[PDB]
Enzyme design. Structure first.
Site, PDB file in Angstrom:
ATOM      1  CG  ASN A 196     -13.688 135.121   7.225  1.00 51.91           C
ATOM      2  OD1 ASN A 196     -13.117 135.709   6.328  1.00 51.91           O
ATOM      3  ND2 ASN A 196     -13.104 134.849   8.377  1.00 51.91           N
TER       4      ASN A 196
ATOM      5  CG  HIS B 191      -5.285 138.653   2.197  1.00 58.33           C
ATOM      6  ND1 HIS B 191      -5.983 138.985   1.060  1.00 58.33           N
ATOM      7  CD2 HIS B 191      -5.570 137.355   2.445  1.00 58.33           C
ATOM      8  CE1 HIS B 191      -6.642 137.930   0.625  1.00 58.33           C
ATOM      9  NE2 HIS B 191      -6.418 136.927   1.455  1.00 58.33           N
TER      10      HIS B 191
HETATM   11  O1  LIG Z   1     -12.722 134.135   2.566  1.00 58.15           O
HETATM   12  C1  LIG Z   1     -13.456 134.613   1.648  1.00 58.15           C
HETATM   13  C2  LIG Z   1     -14.584 135.498   1.956  1.00 58.15           C
HETATM   14  C3  LIG Z   1     -14.857 135.843   3.234  1.00 58.15           C
HETATM   15  C4  LIG Z   1     -15.998 136.709   3.556  1.00 58.15           C
HETATM   16  C5  LIG Z   1     -16.750 137.157   2.539  1.00 58.15           C
HETATM   17  N1  LIG Z   1     -16.480 136.792   1.178  1.00 58.15           N
HETATM   18  C6  LIG Z   1     -15.445 136.028   0.861  1.00 58.15           C
HETATM   19  N2  LIG Z   1     -15.148 135.669  -0.518  1.00 58.15           N
HETATM   20  C7  LIG Z   1     -15.963 136.193  -1.633  1.00 58.15           C
HETATM   21  C8  LIG Z   1     -16.017 137.547  -1.836  1.00 58.15           C
HETATM   22  C9  LIG Z   1     -16.828 138.118  -2.942  1.00 58.15           C
HETATM   23  C10 LIG Z   1     -17.538 137.312  -3.749  1.00 58.15           C
HETATM   24  C11 LIG Z   1     -17.498 135.842  -3.543  1.00 58.15           C
HETATM   25  N3  LIG Z   1     -18.207 134.987  -4.408  1.00 58.15           N
HETATM   26  O2  LIG Z   1     -18.178 133.803  -4.272  1.00 58.15           O
HETATM   27  O3  LIG Z   1     -18.896 135.498  -5.434  1.00 58.15           O
HETATM   28  C12 LIG Z   1     -16.743 135.312  -2.533  1.00 58.15           C
HETATM   29  C13 LIG Z   1     -14.041 134.783  -0.786  1.00 58.15           C
HETATM   30  O4  LIG Z   1     -13.780 134.485  -1.951  1.00 58.15           O
HETATM   31  N4  LIG Z   1     -13.213 134.257   0.293  1.00 58.15           N
HETATM   32  C14 LIG Z   1     -12.048 133.379  -0.012  1.00 58.15           C
HETATM   33  C15 LIG Z   1     -10.978 134.160  -0.719  1.00 58.15           C
HETATM   34  C16 LIG Z   1     -10.232 135.126   0.112  1.00 58.15           C
HETATM   35  C17 LIG Z   1      -9.253 135.853  -0.456  1.00 58.15           C
HETATM   36  N5  LIG Z   1      -8.956 135.740  -1.853  1.00 58.15           N
HETATM   37  C18 LIG Z   1      -9.626 134.923  -2.627  1.00 58.15           C
HETATM   38  C19 LIG Z   1     -10.712 134.065  -2.044  1.00 58.15           C
HETATM   39 MG   LIG Z   2      -3.626 133.503   0.821  1.00 62.64          MG
HETATM   40 ZN   LIG Z   3      -5.671 133.565   4.287  1.00 65.79          ZN
END
Ligand SMILES: O=c1c2cccnc2n(-c2cccc([N+](=O)[O-])c2)c(=O)n1Cc1ccncc1
Ligand SMILES: [Mg+2]
Ligand SMILES: [Zn+2]
Ligand SMILES: [Ca+2]
Length: 338
Positions: free
Chosen positions: A246, A85
């Site tokens: 992403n 972030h």
């Molecule tokens: O953009 C991405 C994101 C981007 C790239 C890779 N993975 C991402 N993941 C992610 C990471 C680990 C596990 C899981 N899951 O669903 O189990 C999702 C995510 O949640 N986001 C959205 C997000 C970003 C920041 N905070 C919360 C959610």
């Molecule tokens: Mg945010």
């Molecule tokens: Zn963002």
């Protein structure tokens, strides 16, 4: 399971540089490369490019000096140390918004004030992020959570910081907007950034689906959005798609983002371990199924969203959606076996 629990607890309620900046209109800009070439200033150079390209400085009588000061300052307020972030994620989302704004199905639909608003919203939407979630902040009885009363705690903060930075000397990029223009933009920006609260995802998605179900078009096939609630909704979802983009990027970009987010998540979980708290899902470095987690994230969150967006702008998002499916397919092939 921990994929299930993550989901349920998150988404529910100078020459080279210029040559690389020529890809500003392309999905899959090498944003990490631009960061390197700019001396870690992607947000500034990217935002500056978009503003020249969309002619926003003439339209809104923004002196370039003012734009550059504001941007440098804003970029300064993204954290050095935070793995995901940071100012590079900000730049990324801005440029993704930029491209989605330029989609044919949306041709001439939005006013310049709305264009300006979605791009600004994008640029500020994660400013001063501490690299931990709203729920972390809530569970640790943090001053931010107290202040904003457990609701969209970080997204309120990002808003407050991004508008606060306008008040510095020669930073008021909205100086030549009318009072009416300024209030309209302020309202739209707040509506958008608060829509970036991940916990609203399902709510947003439901709305976007209704926008597709009730879709009206001109005879040339361009989207008809005749009310404010409809157009702000389209811009909320757009900026939310940019934020969950992403997995839709070329795979070498996608893998870097995945590494960076996992390292931010593990960094939080370390804090939770030092505090004796139960480590959050996907935050335990000693127990994280990354490949499987991505197939779930795509299957249950990303693809649903992007599939509905693709419906809305048909067929402008097809290549994006093809990359996402290929990416899903790759991560699937990579799931470790006993
Ligand atoms: O953009 C991405 C994101 C981007 C790239 C890779 N993975 C991402 N993941 C992610 C990471 C680990 C596990 C899981 N899951 O669903 O189990 C999702 C995510 O949640 N986001 C959205 C997000 C970003 C920041 N905070 C919360 C959610
Ligand atoms: Mg945010
Ligand atoms: Zn963002
Ligand atoms: Ca790159």
């Amino acid at each position: 399971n921990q994929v299930s629990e993550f989901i349920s607890n998150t988404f529910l309620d100078e020459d080279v540089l210029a040559k690389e900046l020529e890809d500003v209109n392309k999905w899959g800009l090498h944003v990490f490369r631009i960061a390197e070439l700019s001396g870690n200033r992607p947000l500034t150079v990217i935002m500056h490019t978009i503003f020249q390209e969309r002619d926003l400085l003439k339209t809104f009588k923004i002196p370039v000096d003012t734009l550059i000061t504001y941007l440098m300052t804003l970029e300064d307020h993204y954290h050095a140390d935070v793995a995901y972030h940071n100012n590079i994620h900000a730049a990324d989302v801005v440029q993704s918004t930029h491209v989605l704004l330029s989609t044919p199905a949306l041709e001439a639909v939005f006013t310049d004030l709305e264009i300006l608003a979605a791009i600004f919203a994008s640029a500020i939407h994660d400013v001063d992020h501490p690299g931990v979630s709203n729920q972390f902040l809530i569970n640790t009885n943090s001053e931010l959570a107290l202040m904003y009363n457990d609701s969209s705690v970080l997204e309120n903060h990002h808003l407050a910081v991004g508008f606060k930075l306008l008040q510095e000397e020669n930073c008021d990029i909205f100086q030549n907007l009318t009072k009416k223009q300024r209030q309209s933009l302020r309202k739209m920006v707040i509506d958008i950034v608060l829509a970036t609260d991940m916990s609203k995802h399902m709510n947003l998605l439901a709305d976007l689906k209704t926008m597709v179900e009730t879709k009206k078009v001109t005879s040339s096939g361009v989207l008809l959005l005749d009310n404010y609630s409809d157009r702000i909704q389209v811009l909320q979802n757009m900026v939310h798609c940019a934020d969950l983009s992403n997995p839709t990027k070329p795979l070498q970009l996608y893998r870097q983002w995945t590494d960076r987010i996992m390292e931010e998540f593990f960094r939080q979980g370390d804090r939770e371990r030092e505090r004796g708290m139960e480590i959050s899902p996907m935050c335990d470095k000693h127990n994280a199924s990354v490949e499987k987690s991505q197939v779930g994230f795509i299957d249950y969150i990303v693809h649903p969203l992007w599939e509905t967006w693709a419906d809305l702008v048909h067929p402008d998002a097809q290549d994006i959606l093809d990359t996402l499916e290929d990416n899903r397919e790759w991560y699937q092939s990579t799931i470790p076996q006993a």
